[PDB]
Amino acid sequence: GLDLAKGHADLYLNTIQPQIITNISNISNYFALQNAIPAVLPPGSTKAQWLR
Amino acid sequence: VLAQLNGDIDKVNAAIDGAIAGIVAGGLLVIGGAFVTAIGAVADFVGTSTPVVIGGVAMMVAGAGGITAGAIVLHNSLGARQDLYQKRSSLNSEVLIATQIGNGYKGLQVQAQNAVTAATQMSNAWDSLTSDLGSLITDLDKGITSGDDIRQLWLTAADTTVKTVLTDVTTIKAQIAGVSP
Amino acid sequence: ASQAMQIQTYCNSVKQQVPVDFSQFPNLKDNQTQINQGLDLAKGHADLYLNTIQPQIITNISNISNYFALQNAIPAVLPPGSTKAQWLRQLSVIKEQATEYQRLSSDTRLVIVNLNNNLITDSSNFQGIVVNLNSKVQGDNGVLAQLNGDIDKVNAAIDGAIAGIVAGGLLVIGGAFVTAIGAVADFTSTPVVIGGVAMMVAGAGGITAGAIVLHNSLGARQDLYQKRSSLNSEVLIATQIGNGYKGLQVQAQNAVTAATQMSNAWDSLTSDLGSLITDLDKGITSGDDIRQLWLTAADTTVKTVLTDVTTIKAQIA
Amino acid sequence: NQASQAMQIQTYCNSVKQQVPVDFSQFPNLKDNQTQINQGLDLAKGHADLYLNTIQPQIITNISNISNYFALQNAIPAVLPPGSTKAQWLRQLSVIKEQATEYQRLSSDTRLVIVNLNNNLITDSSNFQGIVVNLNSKVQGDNGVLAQLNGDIDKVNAAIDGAIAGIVAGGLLVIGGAFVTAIGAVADFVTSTPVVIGGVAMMVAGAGGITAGAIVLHNSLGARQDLYQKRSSLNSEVLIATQIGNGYKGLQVQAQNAVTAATQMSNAWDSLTSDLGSLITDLDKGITSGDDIRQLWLTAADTTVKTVLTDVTTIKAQIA
Ligand SMILES: [Cl-]
Ligand SMILES: [Cl-]
Ligand SMILES: [Cl-]
Ligand SMILES: [Cl-]
Ligand SMILES: [Cl-]
Ligand SMILES: [Cl-]
Ligand code: NA
Ligand code: NA
């Protein structure tokens, strides 16, 4: 019973926890892009470019 | 099991109490008897004083019996007693640990359930972002908004709320690294 | 103290312990084999950390730390004077490099997993030692209570024996006086010279009887208080070692926390390198302004990798 | 080291969510405490979740929106700004007044959310106090009983001491009698039946005492064991109630602290609402007033915006 429980703990510690931490990198990256958009499209740029 | 062990301990402790009682009683009979045996002996050297010389020697034999009997039972018992009290303390510890593991599982179950909630909230947060970007794409395409005012939205957000999210990211990473940002 | 300093402390501390010898206590034979096996293993783990893992972690991070110190940014636009051809090679070489470092980061994390399990094992074996000692002492205390009771009871036998001896002595002195008055009382008086000598014989009886019961009782009492002194010694040793292992247990538990924090720190580095790899790859295979988007994002991401590097370096010092 | 108001509620929430429901199925005397605790807990977790993923974000949102708008409009033009028709100036004031009115409503709405939060916390705090009280009364009861059991065990120990005394007495009579019986027997082979009877009498009496004592003993140890099982059971029950009790006492404190924090949040939002109201009044009375009276009200509105910004910083502080 105990051995199995430790198994469950390991799965959390070495499979799920990293996935959660990766999630923070993904959030960090999404916002890196979002704040880049207005830096690469100068003031007054095609609706076409913006949509891409 | 525990009930049996306690029973076994009660017997051994009783045996030992008994033995010691024998030894105290024994000693008194021997001293008492040696006095009776000595008076009865120099009363036969003058009637019918054998009735007390027997009683006196009876006491001494009984006494010496109790003493040597107690001594056997005692030296014999003492080793077993330690073994019994250790068995009990061991069983108590092991039952307690078995219970603790069970409680541990219950707790882990709760942690996992809380993790589901948390993960679900994360999915929904991403879904709002995607859907909200979709709305923005639609609004631009239909001509409700332009890249000139959308730019201002994002830069305002960069000045405040997005900057805040980025801060929280640094802070979270620090706290799970055990470091002071 | 840094995470590494905490594990380092635990390791140095565990290595300094001495194996136990409870051969004088048959009741602790099993605790001994448990403690010594546990200890031996723990020292193994400690050595591995001190001479293999800690240096390896410091190494891998130094290499990463240096590379990104140089490449502290990503050119998003096309630097002054380069064919687009050269720029794509320069981005591709960084992407390859980053991929190599991601793998190293990921490998470091596996090392750390192993470290965590070693620490968790040690912490656990120690908790077990304390528990098993506690239960032996709990047992000995039940017994000790009984022995104290048993000693109190026997003291009665000894008090009795001594009473017999004093009673005897008084009869002898009393009788010797009656025997002496009865002897100079013909001046008719053999009835009291008998009573006087009877007293003396009875007295001498009580004295030699009491002396047997006494030498016998003191022996039963001495036998009991030897068992007690033995149990007291055993309980004292178990407690001494117990407290030792309780302390070690704490150090180990703290080490687990520290190792777990290290894991998380490396996971951020790996994930963040992944983001950088993606951003570069999607920038290398994209349109003119889409390229700039991804490369700008990659530049933000490098700043993040540098942050992750400082964090790991902090954990170490 | 003192934590923000939101951090305090956040802590309580995270703390309550991590609790495990109890199972006192081994203790019939605690069946009611169990259903009370588990219901109380379940509800509390509900409240916690609501705070963590709905209310706290809502509060942070509303304040961000307010914070941004007034960051831009950090002042009120009390005179006619360089190059504008009086007509344009009145539109610019009217747009701010409309905007402020919108924010006042949002502030007021946030306050209702907080009221709800306060009641949730107050309910949780109360349910917890109740749990502790009901556990305490069960333990107070068990302690009355325990005292009696200890007394009862002390009494029975007499029966056991007696039984053992009987057995030792018996043994001595048998050994004593076997010696008398043996001397009386080889005194009849030298003429002594009066002592061979006395000797055998002793042996029979002794064997009687021994087998009698053995019954009384095995019987008494059983009565004592029956009593100390009830005691060990009560001790277990008292120990569990105390363990959980102390847990709920602690939770109760966390909740009480959370109430205080939520109440402080209420008061902070009340100041913002009232202060926005003052700003709305000052603008409205400045838009419909004389030349220098207009300037009075608009100057007052400008002071009032500074005040709104202060109120905003206060709320932001409460959150971080
Ligand atoms: Cl060994
Ligand atoms: Cl490596
Ligand atoms: Cl041990
Ligand atoms: Cl009950
Ligand atoms: Cl709202
Ligand atoms: Cl309750
Ligand atoms: Na170990
Ligand atoms: Na709530």
Residue numbers in the entry:
A (entry chain E): 54 to 105
B (entry chain E): 159 to 204, 207 to 341
C (entry chain F): 17 to 203, 208 to 337
D (entry chain D): 15 to 205, 209 to 337
What does the publication say?
We show that the orthologue identified in A. hydrophila (AhlABC) is a haemolytic tripartite α-PFT, requiring all three components for maximal lysis, and we present the structures of the soluble forms of monomeric AhlB and tetrameric AhlC and the decameric pore form of AhlB. AhlC provides the initial single leaflet insertion, assembly with AhlB then producing an oligomeric hydrophobic pore, and finally recruitment of AhlA produces a hydrophilic fully active AhlABC pore. Structural and sequence analysis suggests this method of pore assembly may well occur throughout the tripartite α-PFT family.
The structure of AhlB was determined to 2.9 Å in space group C2 (Form 1), using Se-Methionine SAD and subsequently the resolution was extended to 2.5 Å, using data from a crystal in space group C2221 (Form 2). In the AhlB pore one of each of the subunit conformations of AhlB pack together to form a dimer and five of these Type 1/Type 2 dimers assemble into the decameric oligomer. Within the oligomeric pore, AhlB adopts two subunit conformations, which vary at both the tail and head regions. In the Type 2 conformation residues from both hinges adopt helical conformations, forming sections of α3 and α4, whereas in the Type 1 conformation, the hinge 1 residues in α3 (K152–L160) remain in a loop, indicating that the Type 2 conformation is the fully extended form. Furthermore, in Type 1 the N-terminal helix (α1) is sandwiched between helices α4 and α5, whereas in the Type 2 conformation the first 15 residues of α1 are disordered, with the N-terminus of α1 packing against the C terminus of α5 in an end-to-end arrangement. Thus, the Type 1 conformation has a five-helix bundle at the tail, whereas the Type 2 conformation has a four-helix bundle at the tail. Each subunit of the pore is constructed from two extended α-helices (α3 and α4) that join the head of the pore to the five α-helices that fold into the pore tail. In this soluble to pore transition, changes in ɸ and ψ angles of up to 180o for the hinge residues and movements of up 94 Å result in both the β-tongue and α3a/α4a (D156-L186 and G225-Q246) unpacking and the secondary structure rearranging to form the two 140 Å extended helices (α3 and α4), constructing the head of the funnel and presenting this hydrophobic head to the membrane. The first 15 N-terminal residues of the Type 2 subunits point towards the centre of the oligomer where discontinuous electron density is observed, perhaps suggesting that these residues may form a plug in the entrance to the funnel resulting in an inactive pore, possibly explaining the lack of haemolytic activity of AhlB alone.
